[PDB]
Paper text:
Broadly neutralizing antibodies are proposed as therapeutic and prophylactic agents against HIV‐1, but their potency and breadth are less than optimal. We have previously designed an HIV‐1 Env trimer BG505 DS‐SOSIP, a highly desirable antigen that is conformationally fixed in a prefusion‐closed state, in which neutralizing epitopes are almost exclusively exposed and non‐neutralizing or poorly neutralizing epitopes are hidden, even in the presence of CD4.
Cryo‐EM reconstruction of G36 in complex with BG505 DS‐SOSIP was achieved at 3.3 Å from 414002 particles, and the refined structure revealed a binding mode of G36 similar to that of R27. The G36 epitope was slightly larger, covering 885 Å2 on one protomer and 172 Å2 on the neighboring protomer. Both epitopes were at a similar location to that of J3. Moreover, G36 inserted Tyr99 into the hydrophobic “Phe43 pocket” of gp120 to mimic the CD4 Phe43‐gp120 interaction, similar to J3 which used Tyr99. This and their different sequences resulted in differences in paratope‐epitope interactions between the two nanobody‐Env trimer complexes. G36 neutralized all 14 strains with a geometric mean IC50 of 0.088 µg mL−1; R11, R21, and R25 neutralized over 11 strains out of 14; and two moderate neutralizers, G42 and R18, neutralized 8 strains out of 14. While nanobody phage library screening using glycan base‐covered trimer only identified two neutralizing nanobodies, G36 and Day271_G1, screening with CD4bs‐specific subdomain probe RSC3 led to many neutralizing nanobodies exclusively targeting the CD4bs.
Residue numbers in the entry:
A (entry chain B): 518 to 547, 568 to 664
B (entry chain J): 1 to 65, 65A, 66 to 82, 82A, 82B, 82C, 83 to 100, 100A, ...
C (entry chain A): 31 to 141, 150 to 186, 188 to 309, 312 to 321, 321A, 322 to 398, 411 to 505
D (entry chain F): 519 to 547, 568 to 664
E (entry chain E): 466 to 505
F (entry chain E): 272 to 309, 312 to 321
G (entry chain E): 128 to 141, 150 to 183
Write the structure that this text describes.
C-alpha cells in the first residue's frame, strides 16, 4: 500500500483521490530563542486551518472530503475531455493549469448554496 | 540606494599636501570597509588602501606607506584621505569604493559593486 | 457525459513555494555530563531516533541554492543561541588602563621574536578603596602603542568594552537538526550530478534534515560533508569575477594542528564576585603553534580540482593558484577554532602551483588571538581566557572557497586565489539540497455527479 | 454590492440575505506589537470556536438558516408576524429581546438532546 | 467672563483628532420566530 | 466649541478653527558643535 | 561642579545672561587620565 505523507504526489489524478485522508490528518499535528516566534507560527497554522474549514463549510460541504455541488461546469474554463483529465495527469499539473479561473468558481459555489438554502427554507414552510 | 560622492583634488605642484573626501549616503560608515583606489592613464585599476570596520584598523599597499592617511568621521558619515609629499607617480583618478563587507582584503578592492565618479589629481613640473 | 459538474476535494497532494520558521531538534544524551556547551541543547525538543524518508516518484522539482531562505534563519538562530551563554559572566570594563609592557626573552626562539609582552598595570580590588599592581603576558596582536617600557593599551576599548567568555563552557560544535512545523514539508534532492540550481528529477520528502555542525571557519571548510562521485563546482554565476567558486571535495584531507607552549593561568579579583583569568609564565622553551598537512594527498586533490575546473574555462588555459594578499588577518588566513584557542594559519605553501594543459609534510605557521569579534557586529567583542596545557587537534579538509582574479580580458592565464569573508557561504555548503513547501489541500475538478435535492 | 455591515439599517427580510458577507470577515486576519497581538488573535479564534460549538450543539452547522422544533412562547414577544419581518431592524429586535436570550438556549439544547435520544432508540428498534 | 490659555496634560492633544471614531464588536447570533419546523 | 461640562471652571474648552493661521519662526544663532569622548565608545556632542 | 562665567562677546541687551561659559573635569577613555573640556550652557539648564 502506498502510505506515507505526500506519497501519491506523482500518481495520476484517478488513483490519487483514494488517500485523501493522510494529507488532511497531517495538517494540524500540533528568554532564549523559540519564544514569541513559535507561538506566532502555531497561531498562524491554527488560523489557516480554521479559515480553510470555514470556506469549505460555507459551500454546503459540511463534513469533509469528496463533495458534490450544482455549479454548472463552464467549457471555456478548460476545453478538455474527462478521460484524458482523470487517467493520465497528476494533481500538480492540473492546479498549475487552472489558476486564474479559481476566484470565480468560489463565488459561483457560494451563490448557488445560498440560493439552494433559501429555496429549502421557503419549501419547508408549506409542509 | 548606496551613493558615494567625491570632493577635492585638482592640480598641485610636486611636494605638498592634498585632502580628498568621500561622502556616503544610504549607509552608515561604522560597520563597512571603505577603500580608496586609483587609476593611472594607460594602466588597469591599481589600488591605494582601505580602512576596515574591525577596530578601525587601516591598511595600505607597499608603494604608499608613511605618506597617505585614511580617517573616518561617523557623526558626519565621511571618509578623508590625506596625501602628503606627493610625487609625479601620483597623477591619476581616485575613486572611493565599498562592498558592504565588515572586512578588508587588499586584492578585491578594484572589483566592487558600488563606486563613485572619482576625482582627478595632477602633479607636474 | 455531455454535461459535467464541479466537485470539491479536500486533502489533495499539491504544494507551493513559501517560507516559515523551522525549529530545532537535537540528540537527547540525557543532558547529564554536558559542561554547558554554548550551543545549548536544553533549549530545543529532543529528536526521534528512527527517521522517515518517503521517496516521491514521477515528480521533478526545481531548486535554487543561492536564493534559499533557510540560510538566513539558521544564521539568526545561531547568533541568538550564541548571545545567551555570554550574558551571565563578567564584563571587563575596568581593564582600560595604560599598560606598561616589555619584551620577554626567557629562552625564546628566533621565530617567536616579540609576539609576547610582559605587561604590568593597576587594578581595583573587591573593596573600592585600594589598588593592586598586577602583570600578565599579552600577545602582540592585542596591544597597540599609545603616546608615540613604553606605554601600551588594549586594542578593543577605544571603541567598545569586552565581555569575557565564561570559563566553564566549551565551544565544541554538536549536531543540530532543523525540523519543519505542521502544514509544511521539507524536500531533499537525492541526486548526484546536481550542481545547485535547476531541475531535480528525483526528490524525496524528509521528516527533517540531518545533523549540521555549526563550525565557524574561513578559506578552508572543515569537518563537513563530502559529495559522492567526483568533486563539484558550484557558483551563482561563474563568469563574473565577483562571486565565489565554492568547491566540495570527494575524499577528506587530514590536517593536524598543535600549540606546544605549556601555559599556566592565574586568577585575579576585580570586584564583588568578578574574576579575570590572565596568563602567567610559560614552562620551558617557547615555540610557535603550527599545522601539518600531507603533500601527496593534497597535490592529488589539487590535480582532481584542476581537472574538474577546466570544463568552464576551456581545455587549453593555464590554471595558476596564488596566495592571498593585504591585511585583516581574519580574511587572509585560515581561521579555525581548535580547542578553545583561536588560531590564524598562514596558508601560502598550499596555493602555489601552475598547471599546464600538457612521507613529506607541508607545515603552516600560525598565530593565536585573544580578543576577537565573531558574528561580525559593531560594538561587541569577546576575551577568550587562556587554556592550560599543550593543545592538539585533528581535522578533515572537505572543501574550498576559491575566487577568480580576472582582468586579463583577452588572455589564457586564469588565476585563482583563496578567500573567505562572510560566514553565510559556510552554511550554504550544507543546505544546498533542501526546500520548504507549503501545502494547499483544496481542489476543484469536473465530474458527473449532482447534489440530489 | 454591499460590504461589511452594509445592511445594518435594512429591514429583517432584506437583511437575512447577506449573512455570508458578515460571516466571512469574522475570522479573516520585545517592542510594541509583541505579546498583545498574539493575545488578541488567540482571543479572536477562541470566540469564533465557542460560537461555532454553541451553534453545533443545538443541531446545526448547515449554518445561516437552521430551523428548530422549539415552540415560540407568546410571553416573550407577542406582536405579529408581519410587524417583525417588514418594518423592523435587527438592532431594534436585539434591543427588545435582551433578557430572554438565556432560557431559549436551554430549551434548544434540551430539545436537541431529546430528539437525538429518540432517533437513536428508533434506529435500535429496527 | 474671562478666558486664559492652558494646556498641561497631553491626552487632550490627541482627543482633538479621534473625536469621530468608535470601536464596536459584532455578535453574529440571532433568534427569530417563523413558521417552519425541523422535520423528523 | 467642545467641552465635557461647560458650566464649571474645571474643564477645558477646546476650540477648532475653520481657517488656519500661518506661524513662522526662526533661531538666528549660528551654532557649532564639538564632540568629546567620555568612555569606551561614547560621545557628548556639546555646543561650542 | 561646573565652574561657570558669563559670556559677553557681541551680545544683545535683550539676551543678557542666558548663556554661561562652563568648564569642568571629565574622564577620558582610559580610567587613569582626565580632561578640561568646556562648553556653553543655557541658563535654564544650570542651578547654583
Ligand atoms: C572535527 O571533529 C574532530 C573529531 O570530533 C574534532 O577533534 C576533536 O576535538 C575535541 C575538542 O578539541 C577533542 O575532545 C577533547 O579531548 C581531550 C582528550 O581527551 C579532552 O581533554 C578535551 O577535554 C576534549 O574532550 C577530541 O578528542 C577531538 N577528536 C579527536 C579524534 O582527536 C575537531 O576539533 C573537529 N574540527 C574542528 C575544526 O573543530
Ligand atoms: C552572469 O555574469 C555575466 C558576466 O559577464 C553577466 O553578463 C554581463 O551582464 C552585464 C549586465 O547586463 C553586462 O553589462 C555585461 O556586458 C555582461 N557581460 C557578458 C560577457 O555578457 C550576466 O548578465 C550574468 N547573469 C545573470 C543572470 O546575472
Ligand atoms: C615579567 O615581569 C614580572 C614582574 O616584573 C617578572 O617577575 C619577577 O621575576 C623576578 C625573577 O624571575 C623576581 O625576582 C621578581 O620579584 C618578579 N616580580 C614580581 C612583581 O613578582 C617576570 O619574571 C617577568 N617575566 C615573565 C616571563 O613573567
Ligand atoms: C595527523 O595526526 C594523526 C594522528 O597522530 C596521524 O595519524 C598517525 O600517523 C602516524 C605517523 O606515521 C602513524 O604511525 C599512525 O598509524 C597514524 N594513526 C592512525 C590511527 O593511523 C597522521 O599521520 C597525521 N597527519 C599528518 C599529515 O601528519
Ligand atoms: C604570498 O607569497 C608572497 C611570496 O611568495 C609573499 O610575499 C612576501 O611578503 C613578505 C612580507 O613582507 C616579504 O618579506 C617577502 O619579501 C615577500 N616575498 C617576496 C618574494 O618578495 C606574500 O606575503 C604572501 N602573501 C600572504 C598573504 O601571505
Ligand atoms: C606567510 O607565509 C609566506 C610563505 O613562507 C611568508 O613568506 C616568506 O616569509 C619569510 C619570513 O619573513 C621570508 O624570509 C621569505 O622571503 C618569504 N617568502 C618566501 C617565498 O619564503 C610570509 O612571510 C608569511 N607571513 C605573511 C604575513 O605573509
Ligand atoms: C455639569 O456641570 C454643572 C456645573 O454647575 C454640574 O452641576 C453642579 O453639580 C454639583 C454636584 O452635584 C452641585 O454641587 C452643583 O450645585 C451643580 N451646579 C448647579 C449650577 O446646579 C453638573 O452636575 C455637571 N454635570 C455632570 C454630568 O457632571
Ligand atoms: C518677524 O517680523 C519682523 C517684522 O517685520 C521681522 O523683523 C525685521 O526683519 C528684517 C530682516 O532682517 C529686518 O531687516 C528688519 O529690521 C526687522 N524689523 C524690525 C527689527 O523691526 C522679523 O525678521 C520677522 N521674523 C521672521 C519672519 O522670522
Ligand atoms: C569660554 O571659555 C574658554 C576657555 O576659558 C575661552 O577660550 C579661550 O579663548 C581665549 C581667546 O578668546 C584663548 O586665548 C584661550 O586659549 C581659550 N582657552 C581655551 C581653554 O581654549 C572662550 O573664549 C570663552 N568664550 C567663548 C564664547 O567660548
Ligand atoms: C511513474 O512513471 C512510471 C514510468 O512510466 C509509470 O509506470 C508509473 O505509473 C508512474 N507513477 C508511479 C506512481 O509510479
Ligand atoms: C491566467 O490568467 C492570467 C491573466 O493575466 C495570465 O497572466 C496567466 O498566464 C494565465 N495562466 C495560464 C496558465 O495561462
Ligand atoms: C622589543 O620588541 C619590539 C618589537 O615590537 C622591538 O621593536 C624592540 O626593539 C624590542 N626591545 C628590545 C630591548 O629588544
Ligand atoms: C599603579 O599605581 C601606583 C600608585 O600611584 C602608581 O605609582 C603606579 O605607577 C601604577 N602602575 C602603573 C601606572 O603601571
Ligand atoms: C581613539 O581613537 C581616536 C580616533 O577616533 C583617536 O583620536 C584617539 O587618540 C584614540 N585614543 C587613544 C589612542 O588613546
Ligand atoms: C546547474 O544545472 C542547471 C540545469 O542543468 C544549469 O542551468 C546551470 O547552469 C548549472 N550550473 C552551473 C553549470 O554552474
Ligand atoms: C606542562 O607543565 C606541567 C607542570 O609543569 C607538567 O605536569 C606537564 O607534563 C607539562 N606538559 C608537557 C607537555 O610537558
Ligand atoms: C609536523 O611535521 C613536522 C615535520 O615532519 C614534525 O617535525 C612535527 O612534529 C609535526 N607536528 C605535528 C603536530 O604533527
Ligand atoms: C605533484 O605536483 C606537481 C606540481 O606541484 C605536479 O607536477 C605533479 O604531477 C603532482 N604529482 C602527481 C602524482 O600528480
Ligand atoms: C612556489 O614556491 C617556490 C618555493 O617554495 C617559490 O620559489 C616560488 O616562487 C613559489 N611560486 C610563486 C608563484 O611565487
Ligand atoms: C575524517 O575522515 C575520515 C575518513 O573519511 C573519517 O574516518 C573520520 O571519521 C573523519 N573525521 C571527522 C569527520 O571528524
Ligand atoms: C431608510 O429610510 C428610507 C426612508 O423611509 C426608506 O425608504 C428605506 O427603505 C430605508 N432603508 C434603506 C436601506 O434605505
Ligand atoms: C554660519 O556659519 C557657517 C560656518 O561658519 C557659515 O558658512 C555660514 O555662512 C554662517 N551663516 C549662516 C546663515 O549659515
Ligand atoms: C553674570 O550674569 C548673571 C545673570 O544676569 C548676573 O547676575 C551676574 O551679575 C553676572 N556677573 C557679572 C560679573 O556681571
Ligand atoms: C581638573 O583636574 C585637575 C587635576 O586634578 C585639577 O587640578 C583641576 O582643578 C580640575 N578642575 C576643576 C576642579 O575644575
Amino acid at each position: 500500500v502506498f502510505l506515507g505523507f505526500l506519497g501519491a504526489a506523482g500518481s495520476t489524478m484517478g488513483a490519487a483521490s483514494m488517500t485523501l485522508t493522510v494529507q488532511a490528518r497531517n495538517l494540524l499535528s500540533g528568554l532564549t530563542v523559540w519564544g514569541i516566534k513559535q507561538l506566532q507560527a502555531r497561531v498562524l497554522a491554527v488560523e489557516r486551518y480554521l479559515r480553510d474549514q470555514q470556506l469549505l463549510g460555507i459551500w454546503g460541504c459540511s463534513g469533509k472530503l469528496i463533495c458534490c455541488t450544482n455549479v454548472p461546469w463552464n467549457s471555456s474554463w478548460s476545453n478538455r475531455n474527462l478521460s484524458e483529465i482523470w487517467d493520465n495527469m497528476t494533481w500538480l499539473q492540473w492546479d498549475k493549469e487552472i489558476s486564474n479561473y479559481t476566484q470565480i468558481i468560489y463565488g459561483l459555489l457560494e451563490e448557488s448554496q445560498n440560493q439552494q438554502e433559501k429555496n429549502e427554507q421557503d419549501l419547508l414552510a408549506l409542509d | 540606494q548606496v551613493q558615494l560622492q567625491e570632493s577635492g583634488g585638482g592640480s598641485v605642484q610636486p611636494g605638498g599636501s592634498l585632502r580628498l573626501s568621500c561622502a556616503v549616503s544610504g549607509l552608515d560608515v561604522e560597520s563597512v570597509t571603505i577603500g580608496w583606489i586609483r587609476q593611472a592613464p594607460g594602466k588597469e585599476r591599481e589600488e591605494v588602501g582601505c580602512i576596515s570596520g574591525n577596530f578601525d584598523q587601516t591598511y595600505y599597499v607597499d608603494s604608499v606607506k608613511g605618506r597617505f592617511t585614511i580617517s573616518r568621521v561617523n557623526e558626519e558619515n565621511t571618509v578623508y584621505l590625506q596625501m602628503d609629499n606627493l610625487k609625479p607617480e601620483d597623477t591619476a583618478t581616485y575613486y572611493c569604493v565599498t562592498d558592504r563587507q565588515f572586512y578588508c582584503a587588499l586584492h578585491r578592492l578594484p572589483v566592487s559593486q558600488y563606486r563613485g565618479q572619482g576625482t582627478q589629481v595632477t602633479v607636474s613640473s | 457525459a455531455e454535461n459535467l459538474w464541479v466537485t470539491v476535494y479536500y486533502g489533495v497532494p499539491v504544494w507551493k513555494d513559501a517560507e516559515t520558521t523551522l525549529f530545532c531538534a537535537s540528540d537527547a544524551k540525557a543532558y547529564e555530563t554536558e559542561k554547558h556547551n554554548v550551543w545549548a541543547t536544553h533549549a530545543c525538543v529532543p529528536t526521534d531516533p528512527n527517521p522517515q524518508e518517503i521517496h516521491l516518484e514521477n515528480v521533478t522539482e526545481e531548486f535554487n541554492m543561492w536564493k534559499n531562505n533557510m540560510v538566513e534563519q539558521m544564521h539568526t538562530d545561531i547568533i541568538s543561541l550564541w548571545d545567551q551563554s555570554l550574558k551571565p559572566c563578567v564584563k571587563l570594563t575596568p581593564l582600560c588602563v595604560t599598560l606598561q609592557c616589555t619584551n620577554v626573552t626567557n629562552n625564546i626562539t628566533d621565530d617567536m621574536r616579540g609576539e609576547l609582552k610582559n605587561c604590568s598595570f593597576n587594578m581595583t580590588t573587591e573593596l573600592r578603596d585600594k589598588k593592586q599592581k598586577v602583570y600578565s603576558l599579552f600577545y602582540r596582536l592585542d596591544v597597540v602603542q599609545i603616546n608615540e617600557n613604553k606605554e601600551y593599551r588594549l586594542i578593543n576599548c577605544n571603541t567598545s568594552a569586552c565581555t569575557q567568555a565564561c570559563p566553564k563552557v566549551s565551544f565544541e560544535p554538536i549536531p543540530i537538526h532543523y525540523c519543519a512545523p505542521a502544514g509544511f514539508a521539507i524536500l531533499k534532492c537525492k541526486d548526484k550530478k546536481f550542481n545547485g540550481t535547476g531541475p531535480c528529477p528525483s526528490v524525496s520528502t524528509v521528516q527533517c534534515t540531518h545533523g549540521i555542525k555549526p563550525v565557524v571557519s574561513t578559506q578552508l571548510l572543515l569537518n563537513g560533508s563530502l559529495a559522492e562521485e567526483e568533486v563539484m563546482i558550484r557558483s551563482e554565476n561563474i563568469t563574473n569575477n565577483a562571486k565565489n567558486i565554492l568547491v566540495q571535495f570527494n575524499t577528506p584531507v587530514q590536517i593536524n594542528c598543535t600549540r606546544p607552549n605549556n601555559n599556566t593561568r592565574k586568577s585575579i579579583r576585580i570586584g564583588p564576585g568578578q574574576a579575570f583569568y590572565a596568563t602567567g609564565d610559560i614552562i620551558g622553551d617557547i615555540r610557535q603553534a603550527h599545522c601539518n598537512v600531507s603533500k601527496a594527498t593534497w597535490n592529488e586533490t589539487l590535480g582532481k580540482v584542476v581537472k574538474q575546473l577546466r570544463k568552464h574555462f576551456g581545455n587549453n588555459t593555464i590554471i595558476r593558484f596564488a596566495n592571498s594578499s593585504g591585511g585583516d588577518l581574519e580574511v587572509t588566513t585560515h581561521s579555525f577554532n581548535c580547542g578553545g584557542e583561536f588560531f590564524y594559519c598562514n596558508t601560502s605553501g598550499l596555493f602555489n602551483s601552475t598547471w599546464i594543459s600538457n612521507n613529506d609534510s607541508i607545515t603552516l605557521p600560525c598565530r593565536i588571538k585573544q580578543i576577537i569579534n565573531m558574528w561580525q557586529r559593531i560594538g561587541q567583542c569577546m576575551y577568550a581566557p587562556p587554556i592550560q596545557g599543550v593543545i592538539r587537534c585533528v581535522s578533515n579538509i572537505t572543501g574550498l572557497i576559491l575566487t577568480r582574479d580576472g582582468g586579463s580580458t583577452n588572455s589564457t592565464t586564469e588565476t585563482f586565489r583563496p578567500g573567505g569573508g562572510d560566514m553565510r557561504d559556510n552554511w550554504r555548503s550544507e543546505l544546498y539540497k533542501y526546500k520548504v513547501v507549503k501545502i494547499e489541500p483544496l481542489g476543484v475538478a469536473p465530474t458527473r455527479c449532482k447534489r440530489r435535492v
